[PDB]
Design an enzyme around this catalytic site. Sequence first.
Site, PDB file in Angstrom:
ATOM      1  N   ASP A 223      38.824 -20.511  34.478  1.00 13.31           N
ATOM      2  CA  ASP A 223      38.524 -21.041  33.154  1.00 13.31           C
ATOM      3  C   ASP A 223      37.686 -20.100  32.302  1.00 13.31           C
ATOM      4  O   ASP A 223      36.978 -19.237  32.823  1.00 13.31           O
ATOM      5  CB  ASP A 223      37.816 -22.391  33.288  1.00 13.31           C
ATOM      6  CG  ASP A 223      38.780 -23.504  33.640  1.00 13.31           C
ATOM      7  OD1 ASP A 223      39.976 -23.384  33.286  1.00 13.31           O
ATOM      8  OD2 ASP A 223      38.359 -24.493  34.258  1.00 13.31           O
ATOM      9  N   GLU A 592      41.837 -33.429  26.988  1.00 13.54           N
ATOM     10  CA  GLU A 592      43.110 -32.776  26.704  1.00 13.54           C
ATOM     11  C   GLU A 592      44.135 -33.771  26.190  1.00 13.54           C
ATOM     12  O   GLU A 592      44.516 -34.708  26.884  1.00 13.54           O
ATOM     13  CB  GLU A 592      43.614 -32.060  27.966  1.00 13.54           C
ATOM     14  CG  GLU A 592      42.673 -30.919  28.360  1.00 13.54           C
ATOM     15  CD  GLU A 592      43.053 -30.227  29.652  1.00 13.54           C
ATOM     16  OE1 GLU A 592      43.797 -30.830  30.449  1.00 13.54           O
ATOM     17  OE2 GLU A 592      42.602 -29.074  29.861  1.00 13.54           O
ATOM     18  N   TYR A 713      49.985 -28.316  34.627  1.00  9.69           N
ATOM     19  CA  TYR A 713      50.124 -28.456  33.161  1.00  9.69           C
ATOM     20  C   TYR A 713      51.567 -28.232  32.739  1.00  9.69           C
ATOM     21  O   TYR A 713      52.292 -27.459  33.348  1.00  9.69           O
ATOM     22  CB  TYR A 713      49.242 -27.478  32.406  1.00  9.69           C
ATOM     23  CG  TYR A 713      47.763 -27.825  32.404  1.00  9.69           C
ATOM     24  CD1 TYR A 713      47.186 -28.516  33.469  1.00  9.69           C
ATOM     25  CD2 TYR A 713      46.949 -27.434  31.342  1.00  9.69           C
ATOM     26  CE1 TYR A 713      45.810 -28.819  33.473  1.00  9.69           C
ATOM     27  CE2 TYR A 713      45.605 -27.735  31.320  1.00  9.69           C
ATOM     28  CZ  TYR A 713      45.042 -28.420  32.396  1.00  9.69           C
ATOM     29  OH  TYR A 713      43.715 -28.702  32.369  1.00  9.69           O
TER      30      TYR A 713
HETATM   31  C1  G39 Z   1      38.573 -30.136  29.190  1.00  3.93           C
HETATM   32  C2  G39 Z   1      39.253 -30.650  30.462  1.00  3.93           C
HETATM   33  C3  G39 Z   1      38.582 -30.092  31.726  1.00  3.93           C
HETATM   34  C4  G39 Z   1      37.168 -30.656  31.900  1.00  3.93           C
HETATM   35  C5  G39 Z   1      36.845 -30.579  33.396  1.00  3.93           C
HETATM   36  O1  G39 Z   1      38.525 -28.654  31.713  1.00  3.93           O
HETATM   37  C6  G39 Z   1      39.891 -28.190  31.799  1.00  3.93           C
HETATM   38  C7  G39 Z   1      40.547 -28.566  33.020  1.00  3.93           C
HETATM   39  C8  G39 Z   1      41.476 -27.757  33.709  1.00  3.93           C
HETATM   40  C9  G39 Z   1      42.129 -28.256  34.877  1.00  3.93           C
HETATM   41  O2  G39 Z   1      41.921 -29.420  35.309  1.00  3.93           O
HETATM   42  O3  G39 Z   1      42.957 -27.537  35.498  1.00  3.93           O
HETATM   43  C10 G39 Z   1      41.772 -26.441  33.226  1.00  3.93           C
HETATM   44  C11 G39 Z   1      41.406 -26.279  31.727  1.00  3.93           C
HETATM   45  N1  G39 Z   1      41.575 -24.895  31.287  1.00  3.93           N
HETATM   46  C12 G39 Z   1      39.928 -26.710  31.533  1.00  3.93           C
HETATM   47  N2  G39 Z   1      39.487 -26.395  30.138  1.00  3.93           N
HETATM   48  C13 G39 Z   1      38.546 -25.469  29.875  1.00  3.93           C
HETATM   49  C14 G39 Z   1      38.262 -25.211  28.381  1.00  3.93           C
HETATM   50  O4  G39 Z   1      37.964 -24.827  30.752  1.00  3.93           O
END
Ligand code: G39
Length: 749
Positions: A223, A592, A713
């Site tokens: 991330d 998201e 995703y």
């Molecule tokens: C905002 C949703 C979550 C909070 C834990 O973070 C996301 C979860 C992710 C995930 O569950 O795989 C990956 C996303 N790239 C991440 N977003 C950021 C900006 O780092």
Amino acid sequence: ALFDYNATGDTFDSPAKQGWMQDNTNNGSGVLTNAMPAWLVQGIGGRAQWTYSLSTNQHAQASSFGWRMTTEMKVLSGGMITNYYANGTQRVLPIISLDSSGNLVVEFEGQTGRTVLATGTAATEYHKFELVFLPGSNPSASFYFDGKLIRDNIQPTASKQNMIVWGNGSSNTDGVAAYRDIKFEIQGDVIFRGPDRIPSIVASSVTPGVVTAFAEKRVGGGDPGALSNTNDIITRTSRDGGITWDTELNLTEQINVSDEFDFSDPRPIYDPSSNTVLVSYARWPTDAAQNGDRIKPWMPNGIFYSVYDVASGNWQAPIDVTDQVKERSFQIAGWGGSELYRRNTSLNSQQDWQSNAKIRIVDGAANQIQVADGSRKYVVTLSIDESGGLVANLNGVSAPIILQSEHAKVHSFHDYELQYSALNHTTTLFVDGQQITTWAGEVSQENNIQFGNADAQIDGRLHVQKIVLTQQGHNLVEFDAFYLAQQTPEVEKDLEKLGWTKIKTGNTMSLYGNASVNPGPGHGITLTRQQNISGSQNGRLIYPAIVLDRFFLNVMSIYSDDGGSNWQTGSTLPIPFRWKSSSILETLEPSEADMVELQNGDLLLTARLDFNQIVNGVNYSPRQQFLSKDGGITWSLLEANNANVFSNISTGTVDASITRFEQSDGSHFLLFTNPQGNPAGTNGRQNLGLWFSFDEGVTWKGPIQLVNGASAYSDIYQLDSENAIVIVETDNSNMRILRMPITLLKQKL
Ligand SMILES: CCC(CC)O[C@@H]1C=C(C(=O)O)C[C@H](N)[C@H]1NC(C)=O
Ligand SMILES: [Ca+2]
Ligand SMILES: [Ca+2]
Ligand SMILES: [Ca+2]
Ligand SMILES: [Ca+2]
């Protein structure tokens, strides 16, 4: 990957000139024919067929991600017309023939009996034959004839054959057929490789075949915000409907020259008016971002966009829109409590004075700006009413005043100016320079200016950018929260250290914010059904972004009503709260999200809910839907419309996708993708499912399993009148392309 034969006229029209291997026996033969060019298979007294060899990895991809074989042919006579795929262990074998009555029929190995496809002169005319294979633990194919589902749930049968095959597959049985076109497609080609992540995709309606996809390029993986990675936005474009892709292009390294930043969450919008793709994405300092709430308002988080001109293939350099979308303010959430700041003053009630306060009302009521001059008190209380209008009540005056009814304006900043006349001993309120009313306030010995949320029993949240008090040509009081909000921690920002008294009752939160804004994963949309939506308009560009005020995530629209030149923000999603203990808030954190415009102009939004999902014993699940009736400004939580409406959806938190699909006849429905888990309805990021809504998001049918294996995703977008394209993270987060025959598959439901 596409494996095909196409007869064009070019006497290269031999299948052998197109990669196919002739497999005849005895008197079996073939010849070019030109009624419209075709290969005539002549399996008369021998076998006559064509084959294609695949690798172990190609078969494995086909098994994991599905495949489809499409044939346009006419059967002239005989039988054992066998167009199929065999992977070395299994095959689905349709056998097409003319029966003893000249009717065109099909039968399947491993299923009982025959189906008539066409009768009369139609039996020996050209038709389109489609076999579609959906992967899974117990996988099966479905067979279509001129677009109609003929037979479903065709399970593969054992075979050591290993080839794509078409023609007359029998030595002892005559069959004669002319082929215009064979297409065998293996789903799931890799377009971006892990540890890159976070895919999105859009397609151009003005230029059919153009598809533009995005991901995060993650050098070092993981991330944004890690010292050990440098993340950028990458893109690839297809011009043949997502079959082949041009060179991976890093859009942000040009503004990441010292690897000082991470960029994240590419959120494209396709604009049919300009035939462009406008992709918005987050910037972060490379060493701090959303995770852990580590990002702070003085750090270089913001949002940029890049524009792809579809006609030229040109990518325009990034444009920063941070000032327009990243609010800077002092925020007071008087939720379950009150929080006021008072600055004692020495106003002379026998002289004029003026004050100004630049204030945004986020929600609720009891939000106040007050001036008291040692003789009288003047209080303006700002509230959101039932219909979502902005209302002012003045102390001592019974009748409320409606300031705004248009919801964008209701929740924007406004300048509240009080002009006191010593001569009349009354004060006139101006809002954004508009004279509103004059009143006498109430008797008082207080001498101060004061603002905040005033009643512990009345929830309200207000954000403040500026407060000024002026008398006799001198500013007595000045508070610039807009400025202070983005300063580093060595600049004093504590109101109590700046001469204000904090008067707090119960539980509240206050902060300088926002800490960050983030377009979030997936794509956005342009609105086209807003005619009867007051205060909204067609042509609006909009996406559901993630805002972190300081510690809590939530979702708000970010939108442009002028083609992307200027951007505005809407309100955050309404969510419940409860103070489980002093200063410990139980609430939701929508993050998201993806939205779609319904037939009536209402917007349907589906959001991932992170961390705690339970408020006052109510479980909101890992996903929750919301509805906007005003073009995306404000939202409403759809009761009982959460993960529960997607049968067998995964129970773990993950990004999803949602989009509208329009058929050629003008009919429409909604598509939604998300893992199912393995088994379906369990935690894991496995087995991407596809759900359909034929009733504007009230119920969902499905899922149809699209993927057998890892699925995290995803993003789905309409490709053409009959197909949707899906980009999906799979093994090691490898992003793969599915091209799904939606108008075929919907018939399985
Ligand atoms: C905002 C949703 C979550 C909070 C834990 O973070 C996301 C979860 C992710 C995930 O569950 O795989 C990956 C996303 N790239 C991440 N977003 C950021 C900006 O780092
Ligand atoms: Ca670099
Ligand atoms: Ca980094
Ligand atoms: Ca998404
Ligand atoms: Ca947090």
